[PDB]
Amino acid sequence: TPQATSPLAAWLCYLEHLHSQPIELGLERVKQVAERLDLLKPAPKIFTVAGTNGKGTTCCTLEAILLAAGLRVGVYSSPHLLRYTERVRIQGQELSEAEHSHSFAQIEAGRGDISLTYFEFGTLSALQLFKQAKLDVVILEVGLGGRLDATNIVDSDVAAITSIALDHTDWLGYDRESIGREKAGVFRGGKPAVVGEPDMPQSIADVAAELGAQLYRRDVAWKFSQNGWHWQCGERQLTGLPVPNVPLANAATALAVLHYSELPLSDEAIRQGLQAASLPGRFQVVSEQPLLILDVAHNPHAARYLVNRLAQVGKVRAVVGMLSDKDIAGTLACLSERVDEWYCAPLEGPRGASAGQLAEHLVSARQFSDVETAWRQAMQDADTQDVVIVCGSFHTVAHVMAALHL
Ligand SMILES: Nc1ncnc2c1ncn2[C@@H]1O[C@H](COP(=O)(O)OP(=O)(O)O)[C@@H](O)[C@H]1O
Ligand SMILES: [Mg+2]
Numbered sequence: 001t002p003q004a005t006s007p008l009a010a011w012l013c014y015l016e017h018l019h020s021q022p023i024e025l026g027l028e029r030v031k032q033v034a035e036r037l038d039l040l041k042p043a044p045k046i047f048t049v050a051g052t053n054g055k056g057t058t059c060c061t062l063e064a065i066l067l068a069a070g071l072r073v074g075v076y077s078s079p080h081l082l083r084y085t086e087r088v089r090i091q092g093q094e095l096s097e098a099e100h101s102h103s104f105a106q107i108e109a110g111r112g113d114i115s116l117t118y119f120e121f122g123t124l125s126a127l128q129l130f131k132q133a134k135l136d137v138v139i140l141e142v143g144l145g146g147r148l149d150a151t152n153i154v155d156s157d158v159a160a161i162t163s164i165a166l167d168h169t170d171w172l173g174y175d176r177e178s179i180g181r182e183k184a185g186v187f188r189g190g191k192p193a194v195v196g197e198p199d200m201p202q203s204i205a206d207v208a209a210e211l212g213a214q215l216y217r218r219d220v221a222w223k224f225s226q227n228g229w230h231w232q233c234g235e236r237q238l239t240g241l242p243v244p245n246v247p248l249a250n251a252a253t254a255l256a257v258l259h260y261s262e263l264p265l266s267d268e269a270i271r272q273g274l275q276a277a278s279l280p281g282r283f284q285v286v287s288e289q290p291l292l293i294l295d296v297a298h299n300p301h302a303a304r305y306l307v308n309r310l311a312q313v314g315k316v317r318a319v320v321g322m323l324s325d326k327d328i329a330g331t332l333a334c335l336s337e338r339v340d341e342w343y344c345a346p347l348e349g350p351r352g353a354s355a356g357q358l359a360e361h362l363v364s365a366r367q368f369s370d371v372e373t374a375w376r377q378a379m380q381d382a383d384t385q386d387v388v389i390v391c392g393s394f395h396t397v398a399h400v401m402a403a404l405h406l
Contacts, residue, residue: 004105008097011104012084015118023115030120031153034127037110040154042130043074043138047257048151050142050183051162053302054196054253057246057282058162059139061254065273067092069265071136076126076151078119078143081281081398088126090133103128119143123150137263147185158261159186159213160194162253164201165301169325176201187213192260196253216260224252231255242271245278247305281397283309286404290382294401296394298326303334306391314385315340317378320358321347321371321396328353331392332361339389341381342366343374347395358392371399 002010023029034040047062049055059075066073072091080086085094103125107116116124123143130138140151161183164176180200184207187193193213195204200217208215216222222233228240231252236259244251251274258265278284283306286292291313297306310316318339322328342365344358355367368374371390378388390400 001108002101002104004102006101006105008084008100011101015104015121018116018118018121020115020117023117026148027150027153029114030116030124030150033107033111033114033116033120034124034153036112037106037124037128039124039127039131042127042154043072043135045137045261045263046140046154046156047137047261048140048142048154048156048159048186049162049257050146050149050160050186051196052165052167052179053299053305054162054247054250055141056279057277058160058196058250058253058257059141060279061244061246061251061273061277062137062139062257063089063092064277065254065258065265065270066137066263068272068276069263069269072134073137073139074126074130074133074135075139075141076123076130077141078122079394081394081401087122088129090129090135095129099129100125117150120150127154142183142186145185146183148182149186152186155188156186156191158192158194158257159188160196160253160257161204162196162250163301164197164199164204165299166327167299167301169327177203180204181207184208184211187211189213192216192257194253194256194260196249196256214260216256218249218252218256222252222256222259224248224255233259238267238270242274244274246282251277280406281394281401286400286406289384290379290386290388292379292388293390294397295389295391296397297391298322298331298393300327300330300334303331303391306389307334307338310338310387310389313387314383315387317341317343317382317386317388319343319345319371319375319378319388319390319396319400320392321345321374321399322353322358322392323347323351323395324353324357325351326353326393328357329361332358335391336362341378343368343378345369345371345374345396347371347393352395371396372403375400375403
């Protein structure tokens with residue numbers, strides 16, 4: 001068992017080898033440990049963000065505005081690209097590995113004989129890191145689902161659902177209603193429940209009513225469009241806003257969370273936040289002439305958004321790797337509406353699809369030995385007017401980031 005002075009990699013190896021399969025399903029274990037360590041109140045204001053797509057960029061938009069307003073802010077996010085330290089930002093910055101090791105050591109001591117999962121352990125450690133930082137606002141990205149996610153042990157002041165879409169091949173009972181019910185478990189009685197999904201399943205309204213949360217839906221209570229763009233909640237209008245480097249829907253969800261939070265925020269901080277907001281690997285431009293873009297899209301809903309974005313930036317060359325338990329067929333079909341040339345590569349581990357599993361869905365494609373090789377060939381092929389897009393999984397993006405030492 002590692003200690004406070006152990007390298008972070010030792011802590012991660014420890015967590016990766018945890019035998020979590022037989023432990024009791026649900027939040028009782030992690031809740032008990034959080035109580036023991038007084039971790040349930042990481043800041044006086046808490047925002048929890050669930051969704052299929054858009055959690056990270058919603059969180060980063062909240063973060064950018066609140067930081068522009070001079071507040072102390074922490075964000076917990078998952079998964080990571082290159083470094084575990086990406087998962088906890090304070091004042092917009094990653095912490096040292098040594099701070100993480102010390103925090104993990106406090107969690108290890110506090111849990112006693114209670115078993116915890118990797119993500120439970122990580123989430124409690126993030127809460128400890130936030131607590132010691134004396135923050136104004138903490139933003140929690142839900143890891144998976146909502147009702148049973150480790151982040152749902154904390155009572156949020158505003159909760160949000162960013163979108164609802166399928167994000168996995170077939171599964172028992174796995175439909176929009178089921179997906180929505182589970183996410184809505186992050187809602188709280190007497191608190192705003194912000195839904196940025198325009199095609200909202202009824203289950204979300206049902207859970208809000210069951211819990212007594214105040215539901216504020218996109219296209220019902222608030223909406224947006226579009227120099228700049230515009231946002232409205234009843235008679236409140238924010239007009240001619242800067243267009244952020246995040247999907248607009250998610251910036252709009254962020255503004256709604258901030259509006260219903262009642263935090264006092266200047267027009268200036270909102271505009272400055274919007275101009276700053278971005279996240280690595282979310283429509284990230286790495287190079288120009290040819291345009292090289294990285295995007296972690298891994299389901300059809302995300303691919304639809306990416307196609308709509310590519311349309312507004314000559315041939316499109318896609319470097320693609322995906323996980324096998326994802327809807328490969330639907331993701332590739334959607335992307336194929338805009339992609340001209342396909343560069344398929346395998347992903348590693350047991351969950352990765354082979355280049356062949358991708359190519360079998362593509363009328364014409366080339367296959368490569370790995371993502372780096374595919375990407376380098378695309379770059380070699382590209383004319384200055386071309387767009388090279390690296391997509392399909394956070395793993396595919398991460399391979400290219402590591403190759404570029406970004
Ligand atoms: N509102 C949205 N609609 C469709 N796709 C989205 C939306 N928000 C994000 N995406 C897609 O999902 C990917 C991950 O975005 P992110 O904000 O990190 O979401 P999450 O944290 O839920 O995975 C993006 O690169 C983009 O492909
Ligand atoms: Mg995320």
